[PDB]
Amino acid sequence: HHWGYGKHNGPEHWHKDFPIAKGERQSPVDIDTHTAKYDPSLKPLSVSYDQATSLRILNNGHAFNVEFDDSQDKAVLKGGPLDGTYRLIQFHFHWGSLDGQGSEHTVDKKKYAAELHLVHWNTKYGDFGKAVQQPDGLAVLGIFLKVGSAKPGLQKVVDVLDSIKTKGKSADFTNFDPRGLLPESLDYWTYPGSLTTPPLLECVTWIVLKEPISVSSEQVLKFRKLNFNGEGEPEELMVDNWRPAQPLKNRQIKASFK
Numbered sequence: 001h002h003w004g005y006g007k008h009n010g011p012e013h014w015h016k017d018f019p020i021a022k023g024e025r026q027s028p029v030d031i032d033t034h035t036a037k038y039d040p041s042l043k044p045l046s047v048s049y050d051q052a053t054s055l056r057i058l059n060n061g062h063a064f065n066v067e068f069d070d071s072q073d074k075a076v077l078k079g080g081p082l083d084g085t086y087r088l089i090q091f092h093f094h095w096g097s098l099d100g101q102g103s104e105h106t107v108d109k110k111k112y113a114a115e116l117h118l119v120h121w122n123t124k125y126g127d128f129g130k131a132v133q134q135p136d137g138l139a140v141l142g143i144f145l146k147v148g149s150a151k152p153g154l155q156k157v158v159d160v161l162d163s164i165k166t167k168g169k170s171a172d173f174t175n176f177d178p179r180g181l182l183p184e185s186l187d188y189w190t191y192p193g194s195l196t197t198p199p200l201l202e203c204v205t206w207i208v209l210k211e212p213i214s215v216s217s218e219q220v221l222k223f224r225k226l227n228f229n230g231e232g233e234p235e236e237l238m239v240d241n242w243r244p245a246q247p248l249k250n251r252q253i254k255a256s257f258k
């Protein structure tokens, strides 16, 4: 009886195995755009993905992860609110059963159809598993998805999903360029938070872009054909794999833009 997104094991149950679920810096949160303060001290975000080397795509039973070779300094996030260098390890999405929900962060209570998380670890801690034990261990770049025009740079991901339908399936996934998933603007909000899935560790500097990307209805429909279950188990569609907004408590959300 492990955690998930079903009626019996979903977000409202996670605290029993992971008491930090009720902690002081949990994610996601609602971004109240009128109370987020413009911080002129925030730097432009530096996203340097020219040399990113994807390796594989994995259905882990909760989402699918596009994994990167993070053994050299090759796909790094710097600047913004960050001190030092953070290396890309994987990206994944959270999405809904319907276009009206799916994102984890919300903007003035607005839910987007999906949310992309590009996960990076602070190179001062040497690798990901050590980084997650630190309050500045990770930087997650969050990007909202709305349904409209197709995102041409997403289609290579969409088309491989048939080969990883069920939990534990993986597939070679080389030469994928994550620059094709970015919006035009790098304007962002930032706040200190957590992993949004167990173990819910409070190790993330969140950087949430203001500008959503557009994906087509057909693209997101293919996400919704994935399965939470393993091969040869009762089919449970992989939908609504998002954690709702958590209490902000004693935190400030800062805006990079006026």
Ligand SMILES: COc1cccc2cc(C(=O)Nc3ccc(S(N)(=O)=O)cc3)c(=O)oc12
Binding pocket: 117, 119, 140, 194, 195, 196, 197, 198, 199
């Ligand atoms: C020993 O546990 C693991 C073994 C092998 C791989 C992993 C990967 C992990 C991981 O990246 N978790 C993760 C990453 C990102 C987020 S989120 N949704 O971006 O906040 C939430 C959870 C993780 O927490 O634990 C892992």
Ligand SMILES: [Zn+2]
Binding pocket: 092, 093, 094, 117, 196
């Ligand atoms: Zn995530």
